Design a protein around this ligand. Structure first.
Ligand code: CL
Ligand code: CL
Ligand code: CL
Ligand code: CL
Lengths: 187, 187
């Protein structure tokens, strides 16, 4: 069976950090559900790109479990994720079942909000470090992608490909990640 | 007055090559219109991301002229662009007024189809080289971004940030491009 990914899409998400992982994961043969936090209506992202989700989160969360739960960044998107009881339940269940959780840019701050993965080495966007580190519940890294067991984090739009390929490597292995990578013309 | 960009969005466009330039150009303060080739309805991109355009191309083309016309890639998107009389008219008018034309991945093959910028040095995705070079009307480059006067081309999803920043540099200058670049956490 193919691996499955849930990408939780909130108003104010960073559209690059949403689309790059969705696209790359689909290139890797992962079945990706783009789930709208607020419902099935189109989502206005941080830079005004409007993305139509595959499903509401309400519906998608009934079709679990997923091999990865992905949290895009965008400050306002991440705040929305941080405020959601549905997201809290999903991430706690994912942590409890030892499933991967992946978050980029400000996205990792939603892990703090929901008390997920404390003790992990993490990265974030430089501008999100102080938020993430409030209370000292994580150990900070400046690596472009950081993975500490089942918590996978990354820094910003420019690390999105590396983040997505790390997800692919974790789920489908190094060879699939290398095969997906080559046609992308990465630096 | 701010500079203005028209991004022409066709079914089968590469969503990363669509969203990265839109987002980066908006970060640079460019007024970007995402124009749907087929009309104002949501567009299903190559990897099934669905993007809602700002306007139809029919409508957006009445609000010209634009400082840049941007053609995303995606093989099926580029074919759609190549088959469109509306796109032909837009690109011919843009070339005639010495305005920038920017195309990525397979996107440059639409320049061939519409007989735009012959004699220019161009790049494309490696898999689109032979299509682009049919007839020897361009000189090929393996540079990640190529700019020959008002024809700006680039290779693939992984060169999208460099492509977008080259657009920004051309329109708003080197300092604005460097300022936009820094928060992206590029390699
Ligand atoms: Cl943001
Ligand atoms: Cl290739
Ligand atoms: Cl394609
Ligand atoms: Cl910064």
């Amino acid at each position: 069976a193919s691996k499955r990914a849930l990408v939780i899409l909130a108003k104010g998400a960073e559209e690059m950090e949403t689309v790059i992982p969705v696209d790359v994961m689909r290139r890797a043969g992962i079945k990706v559900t783009v789930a709208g936090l607020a419902g099935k209506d189109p989502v206005q992202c941080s830079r005004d790109v409007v993305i139509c989700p595959d499903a509401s989160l309400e519906d998608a969360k009934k079709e679990g479990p997923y091999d990865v739960v992905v949290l895009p960044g965008g400050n306002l998107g991440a705040q929305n994720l941080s405020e959601s009881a549905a997201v809290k339940e999903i991430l706690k269940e994912q942590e409890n079942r030892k499933g991967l959780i992946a978050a980029i840019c400000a996205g990792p701050t939603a892990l703090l909000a929901h008390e997920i993965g404390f003790g992990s080495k993490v990265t974030t966007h430089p501008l999100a470090k102080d938020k993430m580190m409030n209370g000292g519940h994580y150990t900070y890294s400046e690596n472009r992608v950081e993975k500490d067991g089942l918590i996978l984090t990354s820094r910003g739009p420019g690390t999105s490909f590396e983040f997505a390929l790390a997800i692919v490597e974790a789920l489908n292995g190094k060879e699939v990640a290398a095969q997906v990578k080559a046609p992308l013309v990465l630096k």
